[PDB]
Every structure is written in C-alpha cells, then in structure tokens.
Amino acid sequence: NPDPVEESKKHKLKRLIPTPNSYFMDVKCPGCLQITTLFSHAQNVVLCGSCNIMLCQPTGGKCKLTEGCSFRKKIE
Amino acid sequence: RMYGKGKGISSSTLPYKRKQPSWLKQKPSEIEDAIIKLAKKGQTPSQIGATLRDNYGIPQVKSVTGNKILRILRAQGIATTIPEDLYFLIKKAVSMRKHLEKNKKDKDCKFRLILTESKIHRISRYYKRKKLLPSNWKYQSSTASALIA
Amino acid sequence: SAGDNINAKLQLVMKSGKYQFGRKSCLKALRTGKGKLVIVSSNCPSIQRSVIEYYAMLSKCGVHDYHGDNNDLGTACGKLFRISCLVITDVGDSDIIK
Amino acid sequence: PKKRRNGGRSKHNRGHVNPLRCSNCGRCVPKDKAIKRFNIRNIVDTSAQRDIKEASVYSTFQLPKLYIKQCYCVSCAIHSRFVRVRSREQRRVRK
Amino acid sequence: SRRTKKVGLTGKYGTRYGSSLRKQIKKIELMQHAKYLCTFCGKTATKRTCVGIWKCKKCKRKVCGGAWSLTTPAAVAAKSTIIRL
Amino acid sequence: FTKKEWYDLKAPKMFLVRNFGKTLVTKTIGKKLATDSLKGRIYEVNLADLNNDEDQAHKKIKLSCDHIINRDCYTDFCGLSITRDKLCSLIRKGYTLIEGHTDVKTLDNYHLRMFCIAFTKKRQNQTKSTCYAQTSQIKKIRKKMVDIMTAEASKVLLKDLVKKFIPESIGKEIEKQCKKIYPLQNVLIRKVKILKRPKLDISKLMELHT
Amino acid sequence: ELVFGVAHIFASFNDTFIHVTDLSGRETLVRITGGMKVKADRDESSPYAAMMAAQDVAARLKELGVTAIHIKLRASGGTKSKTPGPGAQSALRALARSGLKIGRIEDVTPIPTDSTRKKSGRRGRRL
RNA sequence: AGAGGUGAAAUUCUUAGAUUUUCUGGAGACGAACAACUGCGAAAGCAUUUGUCUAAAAUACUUCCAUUAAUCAAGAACGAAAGUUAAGGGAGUGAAGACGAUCAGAUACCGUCGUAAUCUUAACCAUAAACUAUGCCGACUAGGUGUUGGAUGAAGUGCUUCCUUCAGUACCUUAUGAGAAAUCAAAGUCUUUGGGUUCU
C-alpha cells in the first residue's frame, strides 16, 4: 500500500515524495572554536573562520572531512 | 538523452520546503550583494550558485530571495549577452574545431563537432525566438573563436 | 590547461579593466610607468620583444610570454586583428597580478 | 528459424570481433565463435615418464608440462568430436 | 555566378590534354597558387616566388620550401624528429 | 671429429658451481685461431644445475664466453630469462596479467632492457570468480614497477645486480610496495637482455672470476 | 666427471630431427633426423623411425664421449603447428632407454606473439 | 644426406652444404597467451608501452536555464571487405597465372611457386547475412542468477566484503500475456483494435 509508506529511505532518490539526500551541518574543529556552515555532498574545499585549516575533501560523494571535529546536522 | 543512448536520470531534486530554511538568519540584501560581487569577479551563474551553496551555506537562492539568480543578475544589468549554455556549447565547438584543423583525420571529432553545432543551432533558434538574443545572430563558424568576447 | 587560465584571466580583464595593445601605446605606457603587466606574443619580432623586456625591467613591470602567436593573442583579446603585444594599464577584478 | 538464441556465438554489446585461425584447417573464425581447448598435457605417457625419472638425476626431477591452447572452427571441432550434435533440449545445457 | 562546374582553374587549358592530367595538375596548382601562413609575422601572405622559394608580402622575408607548397610532409616529419631531442 | 679438443667453461665469482660444462672446438690451423671461434658464444644454462637448488629451476642465465686462457673459458653474464613451462603455468584465465619493460644503464655503463610480469591476487574474502583490475590500476602498477626496476638497477653495478636477481629481491620489494594499490601474486623479472656492453676489460673480468 | 650435450628434438608431423650439439648450440655433434632411418618415403614422423634415429645418435654420442644430454623440444614452427609430432614420444623414449644420462627438458617451439598470416585462405584447408 | 609436402605422391630445395643448431644486422606485418555469452563507440568498428590533443557516458549535486523537446521527405557526416587513382612499402598470405597430383574428365577441392591486392599516405567508391534479419522516443507489467561503472550505509582486517540504489549488460524460470509455430520480458499491455513518429 503506497500512501503511508514509512521505510522508503533505502529507496532511490525521487520516492513517492522526492526529497534530497544531502543536508547541511556545522563543524566544531577541536581547539579552534569557530562557527561555519558546510554542505554535505560539497564540491569545493573550505577554510575555517578562526584558524585557516582544511575541513572537507571534495569527492564524488559526501566528502572525507578531517580526522576529528564535531559535526552536527543543522536541520531545525 | 539528446544524442546517443542511456537515460542517465542523475540530477538534483529540490526539497519540499519552498521557504527559506528556518536556521538561516542571513538577509537577502547581502545575499544579492555577494552574488553581484561574485559575478563581477567573473563566474557563470551556474557556478555562482555552486560556490554560493558550498561556501556561503545558502541553498536555493530562490528561497532566500524571491527570484532566480540569473534574474537578479539581469536586473543589475550585468548579465552577459550570450546565455551560459549557448556560450559553453560555442566554446566546446571552437575547441574541437581548432583541434580538428590540426588533426583532420579525427573522424570521431568531426562527428561530435557536427552534433555540437546542431545543438548550437537548435539552442540559438530557441534563444532568438525569445527576445534575449539578437535576431540577426547566426553563429557562422568562422568568427566563433573571437565571438566568446 | 596551462593556457586556459591565462586566456580566462585575459577575457576577464578585457571586460573589467583598461588595457592597450600596440607597440607604440605599450612603449608609452612603460615610459610613463602606468603599465602593470605586459603580454608578449610568441610571434613578436626579436628586436621588439627585446626592447619591450628592457623597458619593462627598467619600469619594474612584469612580462608574460604568451603561449600563442599574434593571431592567438588577438583572438584571446576578442579582436579580429593581430596584436603581438599588450599592456595592462590597470587590472580590474582579475587575478592576473599573481 | 533461429536454431540458437545466441546465434552460435557469444557476441553482445559489440559490433565486430577479430577472428583467429583454426588450429586444424586454418580457416578464419571469429574469436567468440571459435571452440577453444586449453589442454595441459605431459610430453610423454606415464611409462616414458618412469624411464625419464630413472635416467634422470636430482631424484626429484619433475617432467615438464605442455600448454598448447588450440582453437578450432565448427567443422573441425565436430569432426574431431570436441563437440557433439546434441538434442534440441540438451542444446541449451552448457555445464 | 559560378563559371565552371568542376574544371576550376584548369579552364585555362580548354579541352587539351587528358581529363585525368588536367585534374592532377589542378590538384597541385590549387596549392601552388595558395597563400600560406607566414610564421614570422602571422599574416597569411606567403606566396611562391620561384620553384622552391616562398616570400611573405608583409615580412618581405623568404623561405625555402616545397615545389608546390610551403612545407612538405617529409620535411616537417624530419624537423619534428630533430626537435624531439 | 678427431681434430676437436674439449674446453672447460667457468662461471663468475658470485655463482656457485663455477664449472658448468665442456665445449668443443676444432683444431687451431691456418688463420683460424680456434679461439676467435670459441670467443663470444652464448651458453643458456639453468640455475638449478648451477646452484644445486631445485627452487630456481625456472630461470636460465646466458653466459657469453669472453676470455680464454690455456684450456678453460671464463664467460660473463649475457642475459636472463625464465622458462616457458613456468611462464605458461603462471597464466590462468580470470586474472589480469601486467607486463612492463624498461631500459636502464648501470654504473658500469651496462645497458639492459628488463621485462617483468605480474598477476593479480584473489585475497580471501572476495567470494567472486574474477580478479580483474581497472585499467587505471594497470597503468599505475606498470608505472610503479618500471620506476622500481629502473632505480635499483641503475644505482647498482652489474655483478651485484645479478647477485640480486638471484634472490628475486625485485619481486619482494615490488610486492612490499604494491600491497597498497592492488594485491599481486608471483611477479618476477621475466627476461633481461643486454642491449649494449662496454669495451671488454679483462682486468675486471678476472676480478669477478678469480 | 659428467659431460653434457644438448639435443634439439624437432617433431613436426614429418621426419623427427635429432640434433645433438654442445652447450653453446654451435659445434653440432650429430644430426640424424628420421629421413635416413626409413626408406619408405613415409613413416618419417613415425615412432619406428624416431626410435632408430634416437638409438643411432645415442651410440654415436657414446663413441664420442658425451654421456649426459639436455633436451630441447620443438614442434614445427610459429605458424604451422604448436603440438609436437608423433616422433617426439619415441625419441625421448629411446634416448631414455639407450642408457645415457638425461638432464633437463625444456620446450622451445617458436611461438609468435604476433599473428603473421598462415597458409590457406580464410576458408582453410578443405581436406 | 637428405629436406618440403601428402591419404599416398609429385612439383620444389639440396655436396656449390639444403633442412637443422647458434649468433649479428635489416625489413615489412602483426600485437597471441591474459581475452570473458566482458568494455567503449551512431554504425562501420576499436586490444603492445608512454606522452599530448580530443570527445563521450554513467554516477553525485538543495548549481544554472526554463519547454529549449520526439520523430523526421529533402539535404548532410560517417560508412567492413573488395575495387579504382597516385606515390611509398612489399615479409607472410595470395583472386589471376604456371606447374604437380586426384579423377573418366578436374580449367576445382590437395601440394609447390606466384602477379594484383593486402600495409602507409592522399583521394574516390557507398556497398555486405552493413544481422539481435527486431526503426526511434515514452508509460506500464515478474521473480532469480550474475557481471560492468558509480553513489549510499554497515561489518573482517588506515585497508577489504555485504546492504541499498542509479545506469549498462547478459542469462534462467514464469506466464488465465502474445504468437501459425519456432519462440518472445518483448515479438506483451491488439476484434476489450487509437501514446507520438519515420520508413517499408
């Protein structure tokens, strides 16, 4: 029954209601205490505001990110 | 797909939420100012939106400000005279023609050049059916090298 | 893409900044010191490129040897005539300086 | 009436395959259609291996092996009984 | 308007000599009378002066070349091999 | 015939048995010195019967008769090759084989061309039927292996180059580095050919014979 | 004291060449083949002819003084055929039985990494 | 002292040393084994290495434009092999041809040789069982086994497998689906007959 379908996350993009798989997050690089926004499935390299350091490596998917930091989904 | 085979359904699908994301406290005035500055520094609107999303964290500029990026770019009067897709097609055709001139034995490059110029003519016909491209515009294949302005 | 980047920067300055092409104009710009960057085509006659480099090194202005000939330099500038030498009086919002 | 679903060869997503030459008759046959036998065989029968061992030294000498890799056209393979005619239903079975 | 269907510059020969001979001489007269790129000044103004000499109308500079074209494949290949080193 | 006399064949110092066979030459009459004829002939001899170990029976060395004194020929390294049966046994359907070759000169100005061959491994948890590798990985492996077989064959002399062929150190090192790109099974220098050699120096020939 | 020669064995669906030289490959000691061991214009490739060829060369090697022999097997050539002819079996058999030391055996038939065109048309032989 | 070759043979080469062994140099060709019911390409077709140039596809995208699209008489690009023209090349194979055999005959099948051709360059030619004998675009309809290229999540050991998914690519079974049947997951959703379009 296709209306109240609940576990269509494993379904390919453009499900019954097409919703993108990407999202946005904030990264707290350890020892840097800086604020910036970051896109999952990004395509460019980024630099922090406080201390100039790389954060994510642009690849064909969700990037590699750095060795550490605390990265949290910023969906409200 | 226009030429060849393969459906290739890969694309980007916008989220259901049409409004500005709630977390975004950014203001449309500086969004437009940044878009103008970035276009002035010189980038096509597609990659303008790309770097806007990646480095400024403002997805779907149409959500932040109630219109499209090429629309504001035109409203500022600084939009280019040749649309992005037509310009890129012309650039690719120019490059492959330059290559063909040296290697005229590249039948495959000849075939692909024919396809590219067919696309150019169809796209230009559409763009001049719209008023946003002069009626006398033709794209003869000689001056296309400098036509990139 | 060793020439693609410089061609793109040239296209950007042609739109934004002010420039001048021609041996006489570029020589005058170097004399007055208003030149910031001089582009020399690979086709430039040896004497002309020599005097250009001497003027530029006197006036502390950079010289960039174009990868193409004067036809290619004109095409890159968007003109339909040979150029063979360029002076950038000012750079607009272009990264050609570095 | 299309005796075989694959047309007697193994060509798919392909226009042309380079032919090889039958090891028996020398006729050109497409590589995917040719019947290939990679036979690994001794130089000598077991009786002669015993004699080679007893006329050899190192007390561990191992008789070399022949790797031949023949390929045959349909007619040559059928005549050499490398393949059988088989029945209509058994024709589908490959292994 | 178009003056000849296919004879081209060989129309000066009328009906004399064979058709094959006229076509063969046309093929190379086309490139013997053409203008070539002067790599020294960049202007396509190099014309044949004599059987193996090519002069640029702008440079006033002349260069040894082929009988009917500024360059021949055998010479350009040799130059390429030399410059490879 | 009755006018032919035996000659002994000697092997260089780094080898084991040092006397691997006899050769025949006709009489020394006329302008035929019967030593010019003996000079510069090639002997293809296995390593099993040269170092008395079975595990190296798959390789054969070429020795070129370089000097003759009295009655024995001393020879020198002239080439290397693995045997056909082993080469064919190494090739099985389901794996991609890597082939590479390079030209390299040693400190002795000894110009060599070396061909090495490799195969892809199956690892343990694959549970598949094929071990094919992407052409990009093929290219990377070939580049890495050409560089490796060039560097350590160029920074070493010919004698120690041969004495490092003997333990196939090249294959061990190529594995130790290529574990991190694609697992490879038995990889060895398939063949070594002497492209050109310096003028004969009897001094160093006898130095490596003694 | 053990002295070694090299026997190039050539089995090619016709006369089986038996060719013993020294280690270098020059200085041929004895070449017998199978043509002179049978005078029927046939059976040149036969085991019958190969066996007498092999015992004859073994006798001559014994009288020459070489007692150990290496083997180099060869089949036709790079275009004709890859499989050794009927005579190789009996050549090796008789060389073993004749009593001389047999050392190392190796297959050396010329194998083209190329594909130079072989005889007969694309239709091949019709017999 | 024979060697080639054959179902036997012969033509042919061969005491001036053939065939055979080994080495050196040259030449043209080809690019095996890996090599697959695998990949790429509109089709023809495309397999030695490296470099440069060039394009394509899939995937990922909260990037841009916003109907720009589908199919197409005329017209255009490409179009195996053979063939034609002109230079070069010319090893091997080899339409023609010449021999030797077989046969009643054999101008054929077989064998020895061999011109054109095959190869490169520059032009023509525009045809093949150019075949999946199946035009292109779109929607829907079923399970399983694989396999190629991406992307997602997790677990054996920074490394590798499994899960999901897109796009190719085959195969097996199944049809109260079709078909004259062979068979077909399209050749189905057709007398319960009309998605669009071209050709015959």
Curated annotation (Swiss-Prot), chain E:
It is found in: Cytoplasm. The keyword Zinc applies. Keywords: Cytoplasm, Metal-binding, Ribonucleoprotein, Ribosomal protein, Zinc, Zinc-finger. One of its GO terms (molecular function) is zinc ion binding. A zinc finger (C4-type) spans 38-59. The keyword Metal-binding applies. This is Large ribosomal subunit protein eL43. It comes from Plasmodium falciparum (isolate 3D7).
Swiss-Prot record, chain F:
Keywords: Cytoplasm, Ribonucleoprotein, Ribosomal protein. GO terms for cellular component: cytosol; cytosolic small ribosomal subunit. Transmembrane segments: none annotated. It is found in: Cytoplasm. GO terms for molecular function: structural constituent of ribosome. GO terms for biological process: translation. Component of the ribosome, a large ribonucleoprotein complex responsible for the synthesis of proteins in the cell. The small ribosomal subunit (SSU) binds messenger RNAs (mRNAs) and translates the encoded message by selecting cognate aminoacyl-transfer RNA (tRNA) molecules. The large subunit (LSU) contains the ribosomal catalytic site termed the peptidyl transferase center (PTC), which catalyzes the formation of peptide bonds, thereby polymerizing the amino acids delivered by tRNAs into a polypeptide chain. Belongs to the eukaryotic ribosomal protein eS1 family. Component of the small ribosomal subunit. Mature ribosomes consist of a small (40S) and a large (60S) subunit. The 40S subunit contains about 32 different proteins and 1 molecule of RNA (18S). The 60S subunit contains about 42 different proteins and 3 molecules of RNA (28S, 5.8S and 5S). This is Small ribosomal subunit protein eS1. It comes from Plasmodium falciparum (isolate 3D7). The chain holds residues 24 to 233 of 262 of the full protein.
